[PDB]
Design a protein around this ligand. Structure first.
Ligand SMILES: CC(C)(COP(=O)(O)OP(=O)(O)OC[C@H]1O[C@@H](n2cnc3c(N)ncnc32)[C@H](O)[C@@H]1OP(=O)(O)O)[C@@H](O)C(=O)NCCC(=O)NCCS
Length: 228
């Protein structure tokens, strides 16, 4: 279908969002000349996914009425969206995707995709708080890899946070609480910011609500912060 990420998008502002996803790199796709410098020293696997993900971004932007154009890279790797637009990009094995939104409705977007696979226990302690490790088993079905899902939400949280603050957010700086829908493979989370949430404009970031899904061997997460 090409609609997996829809499982983590809200209906509230759906008319002001667009998305596009692919599951592999179309062969022979050429980079835009203006984007080529961004991957001039990159390994082949990175080059290929970069091009595919940028292609998805333009497909999604086009749905919102934005003419196709290069998307450069700014502070700390963040994508440089066209004026009036926000969005987020992600890839992993078997997935490339873009979610974009109109800034008049959507303040920020953060998405992440991961394989639904375990993480090593050493990494878990580095990416989680004790309270998360205690609560996730209580809120998540035994079948799910809650370590990986937590991590996915941490990544979505950073991506939604950085464009608004331009500051680091570490794994210990957000406490994420989950809930599972009765059907067992989707739900909600809230990321509570534990540090100063001052933004370049608008209100401070204190809480970021998101959605998660597990389907087709993937974890997907998305945060869509509304403009009020
Ligand atoms: C930046 C980061 C979140 C990217 O996530 P990832 O799982 O490695 O890779 P993904 O494919 O999902 O996402 C990569 C895309 O993220 C976007 N991105 C990179 N830096 C970014 C930033 N500072 N802000 C917003 N988006 C960013 C880019 O569009 C990038 O793709 P591109 O280089 O092709 O444009 C991750 O690599 C990282 O450095 N994390 C540390 C910060 C963190 O997770 N903190 C926890 C907060 S609770």
């Amino acid at each position: 279908v090409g609609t997996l990420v829809a499982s983590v998008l809200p209906a509230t502002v759906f008319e002001d969002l667009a998305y596009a996803e692919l599951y592999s790199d179309p062969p022979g796709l050429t980079p835009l000349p203006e984007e080529a410098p961004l991957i001039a020293r990159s390994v082949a696997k990175r080059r290929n996914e970069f091009i595919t993900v940028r292609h998805c971004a333009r497909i999604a932007l086009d749905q919102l009425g934005v003419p196709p154009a290069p998307i450069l890279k700014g502070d700390k790797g963040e994508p440089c969206w066209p004026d009036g637009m926000v969005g987020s990009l992600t890839h992993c094995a078997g997935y490339r995707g873009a979610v974009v939104g109109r800034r008049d409705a959507v303040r920020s977007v953060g998405i992440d995709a991961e394989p639904h696979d375990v993480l090593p226990n050493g990494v878990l302690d580095a990416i989680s708080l004790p309270a998360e490790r205690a609560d996730m088993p209580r809120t998540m079905p035994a079948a799910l890899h809650w370590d990986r899902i937590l991590f996915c939400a941490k990544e979505a949280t950073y991506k939604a946070w950085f464009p608004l603050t331009k500051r680091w957010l570490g794994f210990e700086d957000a406490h994420i609480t989950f809930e599972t829908d009765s059907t067992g493979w989707t739900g909600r989370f809230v990321s509570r910011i534990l540090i100063d949430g001052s933004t370049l404009s608008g209100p401070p970031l204190t809480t970021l609500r998101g959605r998660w899904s597990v389907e087709r061997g993937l974890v997907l997460t998305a945060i869509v912060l509304l403009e009020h």
